Design a binder for this molecule. Structure first.
Ligand SMILES: [Mg+2]
Ligand SMILES: [Mg+2]
Ligand SMILES: [Mg+2]
Ligand SMILES: [Mg+2]
Ligand SMILES: [Mg+2]
Ligand SMILES: [Mg+2]
Ligand SMILES: [Mg+2]
Ligand SMILES: [Mg+2]
Ligand SMILES: [Mg+2]
Ligand SMILES: [Mg+2]
Ligand SMILES: [Mg+2]
Ligand SMILES: [Mg+2]
Ligand SMILES: [Mg+2]
Ligand SMILES: [Mg+2]
Ligand SMILES: [Mg+2]
Ligand SMILES: [Mg+2]
Ligand SMILES: [Mg+2]
Ligand SMILES: [Mg+2]
Ligand SMILES: [Mg+2]
Ligand SMILES: [Mg+2]
Ligand SMILES: [Mg+2]
Ligand SMILES: [Mg+2]
Ligand SMILES: [Mg+2]
Ligand SMILES: [Mg+2]
Ligand SMILES: [Mg+2]
Ligand SMILES: [Mg+2]
Ligand SMILES: [Mg+2]
Ligand SMILES: [Mg+2]
Ligand SMILES: [Mg+2]
Ligand SMILES: [Mg+2]
Ligand SMILES: [Mg+2]
Ligand SMILES: [Mg+2]
Ligand SMILES: [Mg+2]
Ligand SMILES: [Mg+2]
Ligand SMILES: [Mg+2]
Ligand SMILES: [Mg+2]
Ligand SMILES: [Mg+2]
Ligand SMILES: [Mg+2]
Ligand SMILES: [Mg+2]
Ligand SMILES: [Mg+2]
Ligand SMILES: [Mg+2]
Ligand SMILES: [Mg+2]
Ligand SMILES: [Mg+2]
Ligand SMILES: [Mg+2]
Ligand SMILES: [Mg+2]
Ligand SMILES: [Mg+2]
Ligand SMILES: [Mg+2]
Ligand SMILES: [Mg+2]
Ligand SMILES: [Mg+2]
Ligand SMILES: [Mg+2]
Ligand SMILES: [Mg+2]
Ligand SMILES: [Mg+2]
Ligand SMILES: [Mg+2]
Ligand SMILES: [Mg+2]
Ligand SMILES: [Mg+2]
Ligand SMILES: [Mg+2]
Ligand SMILES: [Mg+2]
Ligand SMILES: [Mg+2]
Ligand SMILES: [Mg+2]
Ligand SMILES: [Mg+2]
Ligand SMILES: [Mg+2]
Ligand SMILES: [Mg+2]
Ligand SMILES: [Mg+2]
Ligand SMILES: [Mg+2]
Ligand SMILES: [Mg+2]
Ligand SMILES: [Mg+2]
Ligand SMILES: [Mg+2]
Ligand SMILES: [Mg+2]
Ligand SMILES: [Mg+2]
Ligand SMILES: [Mg+2]
Ligand SMILES: [Mg+2]
Ligand SMILES: [Mg+2]
Lengths: 386, 63, 109, 183
RNA sequence: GUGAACAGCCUCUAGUUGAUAGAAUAAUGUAGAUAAGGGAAGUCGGCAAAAUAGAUCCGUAACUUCGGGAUAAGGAUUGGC
RNA sequence: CGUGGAGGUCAGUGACGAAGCCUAGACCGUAAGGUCGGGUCGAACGGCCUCUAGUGCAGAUCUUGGUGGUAGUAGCAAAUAUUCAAAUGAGAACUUUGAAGACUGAAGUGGGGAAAGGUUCCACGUCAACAGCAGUUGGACGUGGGUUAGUCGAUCCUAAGA
RNA sequence: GAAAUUGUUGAAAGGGAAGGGCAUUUGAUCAGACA
């Protein structure tokens, strides 16, 4: 008949279907445009989401009421031990799209990745790559022509890297394997780089720097079967209504005589792939560095790990990326940090932050103390102690 | 084995509700044979069925 | 083979009963323990001593103590041959408090 | 006797029956079929597992709005169940077959279940009282169960016909030649 | 026993412990609760819900058939020893 | 063309298998139908000329009986609540006994009665059906036992009324 | 001891119904007529 009152539809049709992702590891749908003038490097990085804390910093924003004043800001921390490079994979252009034509693998493969190739490690004979590993033997001949062929053809080159999950409090023990586009120099220079980095190791500082704008690709936390009200942000129907009220009252007109794809319906909520962009790196931490959590202004020797340790995660004993704000996914989930697809100028992007203080009190409650030392100071001797 | 009849009989001979007759689980054969009031009477006499004490309701706080 | 052992454990009933409905807590305890014995003695057959029952229901359905010190005994089975030759008896150990004890073996003779 | 269609060698088979059994016809139909053709010994151990909930019975006909279980993967199926009363009636008749088989003097190691057939015994009426004064039939669906165990036997040899060939004057002349020509 | 009390709530005597069961805790329900700031803007309509309440003391308007209206309204107090 | 029954006839068919029923076997007929084979079966039946009618079904929200899909689906969610062990038994979540945890809370889930029921009481045996899971239990099934009055009622008296 | 309806066995077909008409291929099956 015509609405009555106009109101915007509930929820975005660009995030359909609202099904469960095909995997925990969200896919990198797109890599940055290649500029073959610059050196070879990764264009993304694997990590694990540890947790969140607070930051204090002066603000550099002429014109703003808060120029030259402190602000407090939430941040996420993702555990980021060096990634290890075990393969190169070379794609060619076709009128049917990009197709892979070979993969060359490292001679030796950490049990971690090998574990990924299996569904029952303990029972297995662990025979993975054992014949491939041979290929190196004979002078190299066969591996060479594979590198060679990548170079001859291939419009793009990706590396095969994986995570050193053992350097991580997780139980999960089976590592994460993934393709990172290489975006440095010429095709040949690319594969050379890869070949050189077989069984060799790469760290975030070689791909991210302070104040850089990055994106995060991950699978969203899960919530199971969700009624229409919370899943689409539909009105609660009045208290008086029979047969329940977290619903849509009208599921469609009488014609088209079909429920339509565009109305809200109960169903899976969360465990979705998201590619969420513009997260500024506020810190790139080093694992072999006490005073991880310390600052030019703070100076106390302490690492980022909160008292009692990251709730539901653990300790952070590796390099981390600290990113302003929050990020898709949850504590313990694999997560891809990615180089941005454009060169932002934003002013907001470009600001060169410099932390003043990183919160480090217990997240497991109303944390009153940064360190056990501070806690001793304030409290005095207890019936335990010396 | 089914001693409800004896337990009922027990309650009446003794003068007390069934909630307080004790049928000795180890004398379960001997008890079953007791079909009469006279038989239960003997079984009470020698400890095979005992009266079981009243649950106390103390007036000490009321005092 | 077999083995025949007696050890004394303490079981955290608290985290196992956490969440459970009040009219199900003492009953859950019974089950939860049974499952605890089987995880340790490997034995399907698990019998609970009538005294252990009392220990458990000692404060009514929803008042189960957070920690019970038990003694589990893996024993051989007799008569009409059950599925498995082995079984566990569980019993309460009379202890001032069940707080603070690691698990011990009972040298049996 | 007079069982259903069988193709088997009666001299090397034993049989068993139950009639009018208060088990669900639909359920024990499904559980009889998970056994059909099985090696007797593998089948008996199988039912035993079903009861332990370690393998399931695949429901393939009477199964709409059944649950789902990983225990049906082994049979390429998503819906499967663990019909206790059905299992225990069927494994009851199975035991009987074995006994009869032992009596006939048949190698108990070659025994497979070659026939297994449930169908429908007469129904049995109780009634339920419905709202507003009404009555509904509340009914048992009992079953007849029948099975036959036969001893596996190898081979089959050959032999059949000889196909009598019929060639025209031009067909047997080319043949007459072909060889007069070459080999 | 508490209490004004044959109320509610706990108990002795007596009697029951019968009501398919197990495992989980998605949506939506039924039944039971709570919510910052605002406070009827919701709705035909305060529907539903919330608020009030016992006892002692103080204080109590219009109007009236002088009997009421009246626990009007409005306040303070209340344990243990 | 086809059915039930009747007069006539073929000295018709048949326990060496009548009738009926089954049969993606055969044959005649444009068709209603007719014929045969094989299997099943068990006592009667058919061609031809006539006579006769309670004579031919897809329907009537047709009548009676039977049967499906729905479907192993809706469901078996009110009355706070159950637990350990033993015994018995082919079999025990549910029977008996012991222990424990509770409940009804004397306006009772206690102890008796009036109307009504009619053996349900009680013992022994006992599970095919019944108790919308179960069952060794039962108000079930089988076989028995059991109700004692000068004083308790009736009986007597009168009431509305008959 | 029909039918509806059901179990098994054997054979066959099945990309949002199935069944039907004229026609032929293929498979299975079968009558007759020949001397
Ligand atoms: Mg408009
Ligand atoms: Mg999938
Ligand atoms: Mg190749
Ligand atoms: Mg919700
Ligand atoms: Mg909203
Ligand atoms: Mg939201
Ligand atoms: Mg709505
Ligand atoms: Mg309404
Ligand atoms: Mg916290
Ligand atoms: Mg909870
Ligand atoms: Mg039969
Ligand atoms: Mg069907
Ligand atoms: Mg069906
Ligand atoms: Mg279902
Ligand atoms: Mg359903
Ligand atoms: Mg469906
Ligand atoms: Mg399926
Ligand atoms: Mg009903
Ligand atoms: Mg009625
Ligand atoms: Mg030739
Ligand atoms: Mg009573
Ligand atoms: Mg009920
Ligand atoms: Mg339930
Ligand atoms: Mg509020
Ligand atoms: Mg206000
Ligand atoms: Mg208004
Ligand atoms: Mg107002
Ligand atoms: Mg309005
Ligand atoms: Mg109005
Ligand atoms: Mg209005
Ligand atoms: Mg109201
Ligand atoms: Mg309030
Ligand atoms: Mg007034
Ligand atoms: Mg005072
Ligand atoms: Mg005629
Ligand atoms: Mg006629
Ligand atoms: Mg007639
Ligand atoms: Mg036919
Ligand atoms: Mg013919
Ligand atoms: Mg014949
Ligand atoms: Mg005949
Ligand atoms: Mg005869
Ligand atoms: Mg005529
Ligand atoms: Mg007529
Ligand atoms: Mg017609
Ligand atoms: Mg008809
Ligand atoms: Mg019709
Ligand atoms: Mg018609
Ligand atoms: Mg009809
Ligand atoms: Mg009908
Ligand atoms: Mg069923
Ligand atoms: Mg159901
Ligand atoms: Mg209901
Ligand atoms: Mg029960
Ligand atoms: Mg109590
Ligand atoms: Mg009470
Ligand atoms: Mg009361
Ligand atoms: Mg009752
Ligand atoms: Mg009486
Ligand atoms: Mg009666
Ligand atoms: Mg009785
Ligand atoms: Mg029975
Ligand atoms: Mg009955
Ligand atoms: Mg029943
Ligand atoms: Mg039964
Ligand atoms: Mg009787
Ligand atoms: Mg009698
Ligand atoms: Mg008198
Ligand atoms: Mg008299
Ligand atoms: Mg017959
Ligand atoms: Mg065919
Ligand atoms: Mg044709």
């Amino acid at each position: 008949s015509h609405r009555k009152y106009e109101a915007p539809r509930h929820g975005h049709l660009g995030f359909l279907p609202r099904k469960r992702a095909a995997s925990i590891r969200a896919r990198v749908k797109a890599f940055p445009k290649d500029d073959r003038s610059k050196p070879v490097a990764l264009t993304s990085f694997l990590g694990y989401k540890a947790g969140m804390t607070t930051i204090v910093r002066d603000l550099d924003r002429p014109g703003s009421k808060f120029h030259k004043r402190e602000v407090v800001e939430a941040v996420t921390v993702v555990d980021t031990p060096p990634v290890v490079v075990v393969g190169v994979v070379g794609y060619v252009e076709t009128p049917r799209g990009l197709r892979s034509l070979t993969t060359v693998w490292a001679e030796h493969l950490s049990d971690e990745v090998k574990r990924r190739f299996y569904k029952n490690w303990y029972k297995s004979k662990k025979k993975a790559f054992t014949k491939y590993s041979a290929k190196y033997a004979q002078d190299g001949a066969g591996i060479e022509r594979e590198l060679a062929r990548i170079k001859k053809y291939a419009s793009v080159v990706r590396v095969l890297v994986h995570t050193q999950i053992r350097k991580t409090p997780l139980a999960q023990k089976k590592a994460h394997l993934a393709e990172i586009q290489l975006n440095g120099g010429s095709i040949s220079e690319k594969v050379d780089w890869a070949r050189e980095h077989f069984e060799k190791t790469v760290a975030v500082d070689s791909v991210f720097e302070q104040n850089e704008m990055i994106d995060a690709i991950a699978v969203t936390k899960g919530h199971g079967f969700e009624g229409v009200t919370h899943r689409w942000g539909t009105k609660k129907l009045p208290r008086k209504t029979h047969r329940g009220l977290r619903k849509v009252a009208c599921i469609g007109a009488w014609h088209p005589a079909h429920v339509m794809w565009s109305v809200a319906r109960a169903g899976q909520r969360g465990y979705h792939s998201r590619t969420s962009i513009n997260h500024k790196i506020y810190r790139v931490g080093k694992g072999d560095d006490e005073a991880n959590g310390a600052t030019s202004f703070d100076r106390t020797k302490k690492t980022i790990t909160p008292m009692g340790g990251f709730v539901h995660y653990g300790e952070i004993k590796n390099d981390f990326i600290m990113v302003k704000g929050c990020i898709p996914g949850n504590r313990k989930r694999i997560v891809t940090l990615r180089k941005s697809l454009y060169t932002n100028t934003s002013r907001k992007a470009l600001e060169e932050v410099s932390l003043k203080w990183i919160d480090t009190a217990s997240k497991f409650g109303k944390g009153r103390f940064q360190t056990p030392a501070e806690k001793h100071a304030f409290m005095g001797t207890l019936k335990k102690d010396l | 084995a089914n001693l409800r009849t004896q337990k009922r009989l027990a309650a009446s001979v003794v003068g007390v509700g069934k909630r307080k007759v004790w049928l000795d689980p180890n004398e379960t054969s001997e008890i079953a044979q007791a079909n009469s009031r006279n038989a239960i009477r003997k079984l009470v006499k020698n400890g095979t069925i005992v009266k079981k004490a009243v649950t106390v309701h103390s007036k000490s706080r009321t005092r | 083979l077999k083995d025949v052992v007696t050890r004394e454990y303490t079981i955290n009933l608290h985290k196992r009963l956490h969440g459970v409905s009040f009219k199900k807590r003492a009953p859950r305890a019974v089950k939860e323990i049974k499952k605890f014995a089987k995880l340790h003695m490997g034995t399907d057959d698990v019998r609970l001593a009538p005294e252990l029952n009392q220990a458990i229901w000692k404060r009514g359905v929803k008042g189960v103590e957070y920690r019970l010190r038990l003694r589990i005994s893996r024993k051989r089975n007799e008569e009409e041959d059950a599925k498995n030759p082995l079984f566990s008896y569980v019993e309460p150990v009379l202890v001032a408090s069940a707080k603070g004890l690691q698990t011990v073996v009972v040298e049996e003779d | 006797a007079r069982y259903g269609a069988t193709s088997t060698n009666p001299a090397k088979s034993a049989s068993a029956r139950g009639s009018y059994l208060r088990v669900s016809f639909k359920n024990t139909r499904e559980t009889a079929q998970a056994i059909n053709g099985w090696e007797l010994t593998k089948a008996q151990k199988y039912l035993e597992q079903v009861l332990d909930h370690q393998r399931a019975i695949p429901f393939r006909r009477f199964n709409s709005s059944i649950g789902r279980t990983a225990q049906g993967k082994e049979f390429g199926v998503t819906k499967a169940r663990w019909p206790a009363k059905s299992v225990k009636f069927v494994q009851g008749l199975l035991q009987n077959a074995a006994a009869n088989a032992e009596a006939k003097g048949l190698d108990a190691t070659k025994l497979y279940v070659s026939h297994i057939q449930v169908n429908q015994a007469p129904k049995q009426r109780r009634r339920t009282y419905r709202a507003h004064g009404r009555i509904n039939k509340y009914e048992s669906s009992p079953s007849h169960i029948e099975l036959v165990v036969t001893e596996k036997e190898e081979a089959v040899a050959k032999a059949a016909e000889k196909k009598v060939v019929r060639l025209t004057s031009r067909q047997r002349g080319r043949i007459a030649a072909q060889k007069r020509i070459a080999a």
